[PDB]
Amino acid sequence: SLIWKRHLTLDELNATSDNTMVAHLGIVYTRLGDDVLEAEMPVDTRTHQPFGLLHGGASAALAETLGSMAGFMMTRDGQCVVGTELNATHHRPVSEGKVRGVCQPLHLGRQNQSWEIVVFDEQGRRCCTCRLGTAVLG
Amino acid sequence: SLIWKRHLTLDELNATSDNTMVAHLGIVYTRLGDDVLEAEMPVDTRTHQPFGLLHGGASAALAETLGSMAGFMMTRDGQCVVGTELNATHHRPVSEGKVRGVCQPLHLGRQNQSWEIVVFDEQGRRCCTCRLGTAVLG
Numbered sequence: 001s002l003i004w005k006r007h008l009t010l011d012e013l014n015a016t017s018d019n020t021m022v023a024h025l026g027i028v029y030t031r032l033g034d035d036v037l038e039a040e041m042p043v044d045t046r047t048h049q050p051f052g053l054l055h056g057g058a059s060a061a062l063a064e065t066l067g068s069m070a071g072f073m074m075t076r077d078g079q080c081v082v083g084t085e086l087n088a089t090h091h092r093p094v095s096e097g098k099v100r101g102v103c104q105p106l107h108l109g110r111q112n113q114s115w116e117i118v119v120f121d122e123q124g125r126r127c128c129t130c131r132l133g134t135a136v137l138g
Numbered sequence: 139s140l141i142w143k144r145h146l147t148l149d150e151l152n153a154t155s156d157n158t159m160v161a162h163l164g165i166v167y168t169r170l171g172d173d174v175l176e177a178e179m180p181v182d183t184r185t186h187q188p189f190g191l192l193h194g195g196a197s198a199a200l201a202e203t204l205g206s207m208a209g210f211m212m213t214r215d216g217q218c219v220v221g222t223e224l225n226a227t228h229h230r231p232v233s234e235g236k237v238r239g240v241c242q243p244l245h246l247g248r249q250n251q252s253w254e255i256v257v258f259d260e261q262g263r264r265c266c267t268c269r270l271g272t273a274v275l276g
Binding site for chain 1 (some may be wrong): 225229230244254267
């Protein structure tokens with residue numbers, strides 16, 4: 001079932017990243033279903049931590065990016081959304097290729113929402129589990 | 139697939155609650171699958187907050203109870219687990235009847251573990267989403 005209130009295309013979605021942290025990290029929206037939003041991010045110099053692994057901060061940023069956008073797509077003209085609470089558990093390390101974030105809703109209220117964001121490595125293994133709470137300012 | 143390393147019956151599981159907070163709140167283990175554990179808890183004077191609704195602290199207690207026991211059945215003679223990090227998002231209110239918590243693994247490590255616990259009201263509606271990290275000692 002389609003849940004989105006705002007109907008946009010991937011090209012339009014990616015156009016919002018221009019000149020923001022999203023583009024600075026190479027995050028690209030890659031899939032938009034009826035009730036799910038996906039984006040991929042590279043594991044290189046821009047998202048690395050000392051030893052060469054994926055920085056725990058990059059995964060967090062990817063999650064915050066997806067939850068905010070999905071939340072936005074659930075609002076109507078004149079409304080706005082803002083990320084209020086974030087938590088994340090780092091299960092496994094990643095050192096090469098790209099990771100893929102999958103965002104799905106857990107609760108959709110008219111005043112606030114809760115989104116799940118699981119991050120997988122190119123082998124399909126879950127490397128990070130996050131949850132983001134948002135507030136609608138509409 | 140069977141994940142448990144300790145094999146116990148629901149009868150044995152409930153017997154461990156004697157003289158603990160689990161029994162004090164009337165929590166009962168109600169289902170044990172290959173890779174899942176469930177328990178139910180009453181929504182009454184024992185678990186209410188001053189305004190007559192289910193106390194968020196009770197939902198949190200049900201979750202820590204579930205993740206801890208599942209963590210325990212994941213260890214062998216001599217070893218032990220301990221809850222280290224817990225978070226919870228309260229989505230919807232409940233005031234009567236009972237709630238049901240469903241616990242499943244997110245990550246099973248030789249040293250760490252991460253468990254998902256979702257709590258539903260009698261209508262099958264999600265009322266709270268939690269995640270508990272646990273450490274395995276030995």
